[PDB]
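Hello support,

Our group uses your service weekly, and this is the first time we've seen a run hang past the timeout. The protein is Ly6/PLAUR domain-containing protein 6. I'm not sure whether the cause is the sequence or the server load. Input pasted verbatim:
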Amino acid sequence: MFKCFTCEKAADNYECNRWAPDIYCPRETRYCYTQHTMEVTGNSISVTKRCVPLEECLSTGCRDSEHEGHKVCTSCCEGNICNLPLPRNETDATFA
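Update from on-call engineer: The timeout came from a worker crash unrelated to the input. Re-ran successfully.
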């Protein structure tokens, strides 16, 4: 469980890591936040990554969101350099 890259306004995780900006995550951050914005159909439109404390990663989960249009899922990491590309499937959590 280490830090990750602070991506922002990126078209895809691939190119995002391909460059790997020479920066460093903020303080009071142990977990890694991940937010991928997809289109209504199911295409990667944008993605954002940043470091966040356990508190911020207390409640997360990825799923299909077709309310207004674009579907974006949220999730956290548990390892170093978690800027890897995510799969493409339907998942459901309990979030009890």
